[PDB]
Design a protein around this ligand. Sequence first.
Ligand SMILES: *[C@@H]1O[C@H](CO)[C@@H](O[C@@H]2O[C@H](CO)[C@@H](O[C@@H]3O[C@H](CO)[C@@H](O)[C@H](O[C@H]4O[C@H](CO)[C@@H](O)[C@H](O)[C@@H]4O)[C@@H]3O)[C@H](O)[C@H]2NC(C)=O)[C@H](O)[C@H]1NC(C)=O
Ligand SMILES: *[C@@H]1O[C@H](CO)[C@@H](O[C@@H]2O[C@H](CO)[C@@H](O[C@@H]3O[C@H](CO)[C@@H](O)[C@H](O)[C@@H]3O)[C@H](O)[C@H]2NC(C)=O)[C@H](O)[C@H]1NC(C)=O
Ligand SMILES: *[C@@H]1O[C@H](CO)[C@@H](O[C@@H]2O[C@H](CO)[C@@H](O[C@@H]3O[C@H](CO)[C@@H](O)[C@H](O)[C@@H]3O)[C@H](O)[C@H]2NC(C)=O)[C@H](O)[C@H]1NC(C)=O
Ligand SMILES: *[C@@H]1O[C@H](CO)[C@@H](O[C@@H]2O[C@H](CO)[C@@H](O[C@@H]3O[C@H](CO)[C@@H](O)[C@H](O)[C@@H]3O)[C@H](O)[C@H]2NC(C)=O)[C@H](O)[C@H]1NC(C)=O
Ligand SMILES: *[C@@H]1O[C@H](CO)[C@@H](O[C@@H]2O[C@H](CO)[C@@H](O)[C@H](O)[C@H]2NC(C)=O)[C@H](O)[C@H]1NC(C)=O
Ligand SMILES: *[C@@H]1O[C@H](CO)[C@@H](O[C@@H]2O[C@H](CO)[C@@H](O)[C@H](O)[C@H]2NC(C)=O)[C@H](O)[C@H]1NC(C)=O
Ligand SMILES: *[C@@H]1O[C@H](CO)[C@@H](O[C@@H]2O[C@H](CO)[C@@H](O)[C@H](O)[C@H]2NC(C)=O)[C@H](O)[C@H]1NC(C)=O
Ligand SMILES: *[C@@H]1O[C@H](CO)[C@@H](O[C@@H]2O[C@H](CO)[C@@H](O)[C@H](O)[C@H]2NC(C)=O)[C@H](O)[C@H]1NC(C)=O
Ligand SMILES: *[C@@H]1O[C@H](CO)[C@@H](O[C@@H]2O[C@H](CO)[C@@H](O)[C@H](O)[C@H]2NC(C)=O)[C@H](O)[C@H]1NC(C)=O
Ligand SMILES: *[C@@H]1O[C@H](CO)[C@@H](O[C@@H]2O[C@H](CO)[C@@H](O)[C@H](O)[C@H]2NC(C)=O)[C@H](O)[C@H]1NC(C)=O
Ligand SMILES: *[C@@H]1O[C@H](CO)[C@@H](O[C@@H]2O[C@H](CO)[C@@H](O)[C@H](O)[C@H]2NC(C)=O)[C@H](O)[C@H]1NC(C)=O
Ligand SMILES: *[C@@H]1O[C@H](CO)[C@@H](O[C@@H]2O[C@H](CO)[C@@H](O)[C@H](O)[C@H]2NC(C)=O)[C@H](O)[C@H]1NC(C)=O
Ligand SMILES: *[C@@H]1O[C@H](CO)[C@@H](O)[C@H](O)[C@H]1NC(C)=O
Ligand SMILES: *[C@@H]1O[C@H](CO)[C@@H](O)[C@H](O)[C@H]1NC(C)=O
Ligand SMILES: *[C@@H]1O[C@H](CO)[C@@H](O)[C@H](O)[C@H]1NC(C)=O
Ligand SMILES: *[C@@H]1O[C@H](CO)[C@@H](O)[C@H](O)[C@H]1NC(C)=O
Ligand SMILES: *[C@@H]1O[C@H](CO)[C@@H](O)[C@H](O)[C@H]1NC(C)=O
Ligand SMILES: *[C@@H]1O[C@H](CO)[C@@H](O)[C@H](O)[C@H]1NC(C)=O
Ligand SMILES: *[C@@H]1O[C@H](CO)[C@@H](O)[C@H](O)[C@H]1NC(C)=O
Ligand SMILES: *[C@@H]1O[C@H](CO)[C@@H](O)[C@H](O)[C@H]1NC(C)=O
Ligand SMILES: *[C@@H]1O[C@H](CO)[C@@H](O)[C@H](O)[C@H]1NC(C)=O
Ligand SMILES: *[C@@H]1O[C@H](CO)[C@@H](O)[C@H](O)[C@H]1NC(C)=O
Ligand SMILES: *[C@@H]1O[C@H](CO)[C@@H](O)[C@H](O)[C@H]1NC(C)=O
Ligand SMILES: *[C@@H]1O[C@H](CO)[C@@H](O)[C@H](O)[C@H]1NC(C)=O
Ligand SMILES: *[C@@H]1O[C@H](CO)[C@@H](O)[C@H](O)[C@H]1NC(C)=O
Ligand SMILES: *[C@@H]1O[C@H](CO)[C@@H](O)[C@H](O)[C@H]1NC(C)=O
Ligand SMILES: *[C@@H]1O[C@H](CO)[C@@H](O)[C@H](O)[C@H]1NC(C)=O
Ligand SMILES: *[C@@H]1O[C@H](CO)[C@@H](O)[C@H](O)[C@H]1NC(C)=O
Lengths: 124, 124, 124, 442, 48, 47
Amino acid sequence: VSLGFLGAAGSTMGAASMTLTVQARNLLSHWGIKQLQARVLAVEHYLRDQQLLGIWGCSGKLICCTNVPWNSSWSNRNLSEIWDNMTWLQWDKEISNYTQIIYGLLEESQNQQEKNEQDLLALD
Amino acid sequence: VSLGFLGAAGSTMGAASMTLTVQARNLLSHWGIKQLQARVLAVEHYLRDQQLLGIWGCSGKLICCTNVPWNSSWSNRNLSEIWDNMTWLQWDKEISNYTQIIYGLLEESQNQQEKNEQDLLALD
Amino acid sequence: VSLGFLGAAGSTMGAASMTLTVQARNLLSHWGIKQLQARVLAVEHYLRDQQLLGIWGCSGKLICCTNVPWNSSWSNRNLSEIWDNMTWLQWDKEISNYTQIIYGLLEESQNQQEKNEQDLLALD
Amino acid sequence: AENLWVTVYYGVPVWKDAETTLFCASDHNVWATHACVPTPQEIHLENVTEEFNMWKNNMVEQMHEDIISLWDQSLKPCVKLTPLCVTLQCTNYAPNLLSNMRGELKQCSFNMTTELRDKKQKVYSLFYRLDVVQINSNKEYRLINCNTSAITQACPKVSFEPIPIHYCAPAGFAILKCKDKKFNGTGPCPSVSTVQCTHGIKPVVSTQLLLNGSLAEEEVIIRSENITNNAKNILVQLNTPVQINCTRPNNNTVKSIRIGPGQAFYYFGDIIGDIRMAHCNVSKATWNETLGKVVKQLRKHFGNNTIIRFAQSSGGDLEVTTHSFNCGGEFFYCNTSGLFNSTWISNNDSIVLPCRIKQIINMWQRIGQAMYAPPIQGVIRCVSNITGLILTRDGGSTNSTTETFRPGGGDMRDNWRSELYKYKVVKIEPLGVAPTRCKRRV
Amino acid sequence: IRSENITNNAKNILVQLNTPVQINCTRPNNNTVKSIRIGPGQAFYYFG
Amino acid sequence: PQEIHLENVTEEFNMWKNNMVEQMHEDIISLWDQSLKPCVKLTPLCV
Ligand SMILES: *[C@@H]1O[C@H](CO)[C@@H](O[C@@H]2O[C@H](CO)[C@@H](O[C@@H]3O[C@H](CO)[C@@H](O)[C@H](O[C@H]4O[C@H](CO)[C@@H](O)[C@H](O)[C@@H]4O)[C@@H]3O)[C@H](O)[C@H]2NC(C)=O)[C@H](O)[C@H]1NC(C)=O
Ligand SMILES: *[C@@H]1O[C@H](CO)[C@@H](O[C@@H]2O[C@H](CO)[C@@H](O[C@@H]3O[C@H](CO)[C@@H](O)[C@H](O)[C@@H]3O)[C@H](O)[C@H]2NC(C)=O)[C@H](O)[C@H]1NC(C)=O
Ligand SMILES: *[C@@H]1O[C@H](CO)[C@@H](O[C@@H]2O[C@H](CO)[C@@H](O[C@@H]3O[C@H](CO)[C@@H](O)[C@H](O)[C@@H]3O)[C@H](O)[C@H]2NC(C)=O)[C@H](O)[C@H]1NC(C)=O
Ligand SMILES: *[C@@H]1O[C@H](CO)[C@@H](O[C@@H]2O[C@H](CO)[C@@H](O[C@@H]3O[C@H](CO)[C@@H](O)[C@H](O)[C@@H]3O)[C@H](O)[C@H]2NC(C)=O)[C@H](O)[C@H]1NC(C)=O
Ligand SMILES: *[C@@H]1O[C@H](CO)[C@@H](O[C@@H]2O[C@H](CO)[C@@H](O)[C@H](O)[C@H]2NC(C)=O)[C@H](O)[C@H]1NC(C)=O
Ligand SMILES: *[C@@H]1O[C@H](CO)[C@@H](O[C@@H]2O[C@H](CO)[C@@H](O)[C@H](O)[C@H]2NC(C)=O)[C@H](O)[C@H]1NC(C)=O
Ligand SMILES: *[C@@H]1O[C@H](CO)[C@@H](O[C@@H]2O[C@H](CO)[C@@H](O)[C@H](O)[C@H]2NC(C)=O)[C@H](O)[C@H]1NC(C)=O
Ligand SMILES: *[C@@H]1O[C@H](CO)[C@@H](O[C@@H]2O[C@H](CO)[C@@H](O)[C@H](O)[C@H]2NC(C)=O)[C@H](O)[C@H]1NC(C)=O
Ligand SMILES: *[C@@H]1O[C@H](CO)[C@@H](O[C@@H]2O[C@H](CO)[C@@H](O)[C@H](O)[C@H]2NC(C)=O)[C@H](O)[C@H]1NC(C)=O
Ligand SMILES: *[C@@H]1O[C@H](CO)[C@@H](O[C@@H]2O[C@H](CO)[C@@H](O)[C@H](O)[C@H]2NC(C)=O)[C@H](O)[C@H]1NC(C)=O
Ligand SMILES: *[C@@H]1O[C@H](CO)[C@@H](O[C@@H]2O[C@H](CO)[C@@H](O)[C@H](O)[C@H]2NC(C)=O)[C@H](O)[C@H]1NC(C)=O
Ligand SMILES: *[C@@H]1O[C@H](CO)[C@@H](O[C@@H]2O[C@H](CO)[C@@H](O)[C@H](O)[C@H]2NC(C)=O)[C@H](O)[C@H]1NC(C)=O
Ligand SMILES: *[C@@H]1O[C@H](CO)[C@@H](O)[C@H](O)[C@H]1NC(C)=O
Ligand SMILES: *[C@@H]1O[C@H](CO)[C@@H](O)[C@H](O)[C@H]1NC(C)=O
Ligand SMILES: *[C@@H]1O[C@H](CO)[C@@H](O)[C@H](O)[C@H]1NC(C)=O
Ligand SMILES: *[C@@H]1O[C@H](CO)[C@@H](O)[C@H](O)[C@H]1NC(C)=O
Ligand SMILES: *[C@@H]1O[C@H](CO)[C@@H](O)[C@H](O)[C@H]1NC(C)=O
Ligand SMILES: *[C@@H]1O[C@H](CO)[C@@H](O)[C@H](O)[C@H]1NC(C)=O
Ligand SMILES: *[C@@H]1O[C@H](CO)[C@@H](O)[C@H](O)[C@H]1NC(C)=O
Ligand SMILES: *[C@@H]1O[C@H](CO)[C@@H](O)[C@H](O)[C@H]1NC(C)=O
Ligand SMILES: *[C@@H]1O[C@H](CO)[C@@H](O)[C@H](O)[C@H]1NC(C)=O
Ligand SMILES: *[C@@H]1O[C@H](CO)[C@@H](O)[C@H](O)[C@H]1NC(C)=O
Ligand SMILES: *[C@@H]1O[C@H](CO)[C@@H](O)[C@H](O)[C@H]1NC(C)=O
Ligand SMILES: *[C@@H]1O[C@H](CO)[C@@H](O)[C@H](O)[C@H]1NC(C)=O
Ligand SMILES: *[C@@H]1O[C@H](CO)[C@@H](O)[C@H](O)[C@H]1NC(C)=O
Ligand SMILES: *[C@@H]1O[C@H](CO)[C@@H](O)[C@H](O)[C@H]1NC(C)=O
Ligand SMILES: *[C@@H]1O[C@H](CO)[C@@H](O)[C@H](O)[C@H]1NC(C)=O
Ligand SMILES: *[C@@H]1O[C@H](CO)[C@@H](O)[C@H](O)[C@H]1NC(C)=O
């Protein structure tokens, strides 16, 4: 069932992959100063990486899989225990020192090359 | 013609359905405190349901026809006078209660189910 | 190579058309008043025309080419020296007047009409 | 197909000039860096020209006025110091000291309210002869500006040292800077570049010389506005610095008396040691070398054959007539004579300069506010790095009659215009459209 | 006319004209001022 | 309300190193002396 906000955080990834809008809907939901300080803080911390995934070619949806392979030198783990034994709290750790090359070759190699192929093939 | 902001608000729905950008364009267009107070509420009162629109599967457009049927127990009205006699100021009233179950089964039966048919067809 | 922020601004348009994310990524990247004044300033000076590119039918991408012809009375210049000799700093000048009729005619002729045809044809 | 079609672009690198505010950023309590944002990524630009225009820059203004507002933000929550104006019974202190130190340092005497309201108290102090004026035995005295302003003291634990500061623009705006070695006010710079936030500036208050300041490149230059017009002033900048030392030679204890409810005062106590005066040594030969360099430079702007003369200050009040600057929590006023003494034609020792000091200042040219400054226990040393100066000219006659120069100044705004000439901030615009061969797509 | 409550006699009455009428007045006397300092740095004016 | 219970998860707390203790400790200072300021200045009670 729909547990709540950060609900299935301890469980495995596959059950966590089932329901995700519970994180989405709560994400925006003399002493005036820190009220006005906090609201601008929250809205910029939201849409900083809202535009930074808006550049990632699937601004609308929540899950997209685009035209880029995987470096096996990052990890050599077979698909099963990725999705059956390890949970998300572990998963970010081993790609902590690498996340920059993810964000690097993710964006500069894809949304140009496919749109170069737009501008030159589909618009020829 | 383009009458103006809230222009055709008294007219019927079909004429109101013709022109709609005039509501879009005007929507963002010691005493410093309340100018800075006005602007932050203006921008995030806008994009609270802009992001709630974004989760509704058609973040780009203004009208999208998605994969969800209709509980006829909400209203049993023949299609003509839906679009010919009743205007929008009347229309919100009789669905003022189901508005939560509207928003409930809106995309938590669609961007959960078209989610899943991505997930297991298009992601497949 | 990726030179930097406003990098290839002096070069020709074709080289400038190659790399564009370096402008996108750096667009969001008693004396508290002008801190909080600057931040609200910058965020909606960003997404005023983020939303008015959103009404232009290609909210996701950065280059889209839609269903709208070109009037030769704006300029009669052949394709070559458009993309080979003149740079962007010159290019805005000679359409510094017609900019409103660009922004006028652009999607009032499109983002209804294409989806008028969507609402009446492919949802029929 | 041969009809073309328009497309959009996003992020086209063009700018237009505008003006918004900026913000400060840097890296016990001083005026400036109580709470700001801690901190490169310089990006070189090329194949592009731009025409600068200093003296129409705007950032000079808002920085000039928020340091006003910073300065009198700082002093306010310390003690309102009103009842310091009763008559003064007073005399010259310590005669039969027949040196140059004779008119200096009168000793005075007065009444003061006690901690509790009705009682009275008598306490005694020293002052300088520029501090306090008689109104028409002893004479009766009141200090120079009890009228037309109030007075309050700087609460003693805070400091007066100038921290370096960076200025920085918000997003959607851009810092462009000319990287030419030689630059003369305005011009097309064929090598400009962009930064996010400016480099460091130490904003110290100075009159008639620039101190611990930024240097220039190998050739000394001048800057003006009106150059043959003579109304306004003239700035110069050297390439290599010369140095300076001075000091106050006294050990000079302090004492503390409460005034009313919960307040504290400090007055200048009494003098242990001998009596001397403040003087300031400079190197003679290096000074002649650099000034001969700067006049050999500026002969380009007045004809290769003319005679030029250096003269002293004209007059007016003390605030314009001499080089004045703080050091470590006091205020200086020297004579500034023996360095504008020369004339010039076509074909180990040092220099003393006398220097008096004042106790309360009224700067900013804004009558209405006046600070009291507590004297400092202990001896003072003060070294500096000497750079540039300011200059003005007089009227005259036809253009052969031996033009003459004098150090002038006075105005506070030009004191920064010497070190942010190389900056211009601008607003980008990322949206543009263009026709192209996109066969228009549904 | 404009009231809130007209049968209620508690509150006040507003009306509005349709044409303006005009009004002149003045003070007919030539007058002097003098300036006396109070204490530290202040200025006062009284009727001369 | 809307409290949400969690499950299958551990965490190590650290009291005495919290930061909000400070935040509220100093804004209660500033609230207290904000409150008393615009009422009566009471000086001449010392004879
Ligand atoms: C121009 O350039 C000079 C370069 O010297 C520059 O800096 C000065 O540097 C000296 C060297 O540190 C500072 O002098 C002293 O340092 C000793 C270290 O032992 C301290 O004893 C001094 O003050 C301490 O003691 C006080 C007594 O209780 C304390 O209240 C105080 O907080 C200190 O702990 C003192 O720091 C000197 O301070 C600076 N500044 C000056 C003005 O000399 C100088 O700042 C540059 N700018 C100007 C405008 O001169
Ligand atoms: C500070 O205030 C105190 C409190 O009043 C002063 O003490 C008293 O001051 C008055 C006038 O200053 C003195 O009065 C004069 O004394 C001579 C003595 O013969 C007399 O001839 C005068 O006509 C007048 O009375 C008075 O002696 C003195 N002491 C007392 C106990 O009353 C004090 O002088 C003030 N300090 C100053 C003004 O520097
Ligand atoms: C407040 O009091 C101060 C000090 O008593 C006044 O400042 C002084 O004002 C007098 C006005 O007579 C000026 O005196 C002049 O001095 C010059 C010196 O060159 C002399 O040539 C003149 O004959 C005249 O005496 C003087 O400029 C000024 N300063 C000093 C040190 O005397 C001030 O005017 C008073 N009023 C206000 C409103 O501040
Ligand atoms: C005018 O203002 C007040 C309230 O804003 C109302 O005025 C008077 O209200 C009293 C109290 O109800 C009425 O008097 C009596 O009321 C009792 C209620 O039990 C009733 O039994 C009596 O028959 C009598 O009516 C009174 O009518 C009323 N008006 C007066 C004195 O002029 C009133 O509601 C307001 N008027 C409006 C809204 O038109
Ligand atoms: C600055 O301008 C020069 C000349 O305009 C550029 O020169 C390049 O020259 C080579 C030589 O064959 C050409 O292949 C390139 O197409 C030229 N580039 C451009 C943009 O015209 C030089 O590259 C320019 N600098 C930069 C960074 O583009
Ligand atoms: C392309 O250029 C102009 C821009 O509107 C149009 O020329 C107009 O034509 C009408 C028809 O007679 C005239 O009344 C106007 O005076 C003309 N000028 C302007 C500035 O409007 C021309 O029709 C446009 N072509 C298309 C296909 O839109
Ligand atoms: C600032 O220095 C520059 C150095 O290039 C001067 O630029 C040129 O100087 C020559 C000298 O004969 C003039 O003939 C040119 O007209 C100048 N260039 C341009 C584009 O005008 C410039 O004259 C100097 N300016 C000042 C005010 O000293
Ligand atoms: C700089 O000084 C000149 C000196 O007169 C000012 O005045 C005009 O000067 C010219 C010399 O070219 C004369 O021929 C004109 O006749 C003067 N004015 C008139 C009314 O004819 C000039 O105004 C000054 N100001 C600046 C900043 O240049
Ligand atoms: C500045 O110059 C004066 C004058 O030469 C120097 O004063 C000398 O200081 C020493 C040290 O106490 C004495 O022994 C001498 O008698 C002083 N006078 C002379 C004439 O030498 C002073 O040292 C110099 N430097 C500073 C920083 O003041
Ligand atoms: C300046 O005056 C102070 C105050 O007397 C002197 O400091 C004293 O020095 C003696 C010598 O050792 C000590 O016994 C005292 O305890 C010191 N007093 C204090 C309050 O610390 C000082 O020597 C004088 N000279 C200089 C150059 O500072
Ligand atoms: C600073 O020193 C100069 C030089 O002594 C002083 O100027 C002298 O002032 C007196 C009195 O007016 C004149 O008689 C002298 O002719 C002036 N020059 C000489 C050679 O003494 C000046 O007064 C002193 N104070 C300042 C800073 O002006
Ligand atoms: C009010 O009184 C003033 C003060 O006398 C009058 O002003 C004077 O008028 C005479 C007549 O020409 C002048 O010579 C004086 O110089 C004026 N004095 C001042 C201070 O201005 C004034 O005329 C009177 N009447 C009014 C204002 O109606
Ligand atoms: C918690 O872990 C246990 C251990 O097997 C498991 O049976 C249970 O389903 C888990 N609960 C959730 C909500 O994941
Ligand atoms: C994976 O990353 C390493 C890092 O240097 C690189 O050497 C290797 O070639 C990458 N793998 C592939 C298939 O490119
Ligand atoms: C998958 O990983 C487990 C982990 O030990 C391993 O035993 C198994 O052989 C792996 N499967 C394949 C096909 O390599
Ligand atoms: C991984 O990130 C940490 C954070 O301290 C950094 O110190 C470390 O160098 C990076 N580790 C490696 C080995 O890359
Ligand atoms: C207003 O109502 C009349 C009644 O028929 C109709 O003719 C008219 O079109 C309406 N106005 C608008 C703007 O629809
Ligand atoms: C329509 O909604 C009502 C709400 O109470 C529900 O009882 C009914 O079963 C629904 N009808 C269908 C067909 O789901
Ligand atoms: C359509 O609705 C109107 C509204 O009263 C009604 O008169 C008409 O009979 C309805 N048509 C059908 C087919 O039920
Ligand atoms: C519908 O919404 C209104 C809003 O007040 C609420 O009072 C009502 O109970 C809801 N349901 C019904 C029966 O109207
Ligand atoms: C394209 O423009 C250039 C500009 O002068 C011209 O020389 C050339 O003839 C043009 N080409 C055509 C096909 O019109
Ligand atoms: C183009 O814009 C400018 C801005 O002043 C305007 O003055 C001019 O009229 C417009 N140019 C023309 C003549 O269309
Ligand atoms: C100035 O004072 C410093 C103090 O350390 C001394 O070293 C230097 O020799 C003095 N003179 C000059 C000309 O710098
Ligand atoms: C000026 O400097 C020169 C050295 O180039 C020297 O001959 C002359 O004596 C100097 N004059 C003064 C006053 O220092
Ligand atoms: C003026 O003197 C400078 C000094 O080197 C020289 O370079 C220049 O040629 C001279 N110009 C004239 C016009 O005399
Ligand atoms: C210039 O220096 C000489 C040498 O002491 C002196 O006689 C003369 O008075 C000085 N000039 C001035 C204005 O002090
Ligand atoms: C003064 O000039 C010297 C020359 O080395 C330079 O090193 C120093 O940074 C400048 N500043 C200070 C305070 O010495
Ligand atoms: C008021 O006085 C003025 C003086 O200009 C006169 O013209 C006018 O008739 C008077 N009456 C009014 C305005 O009712």
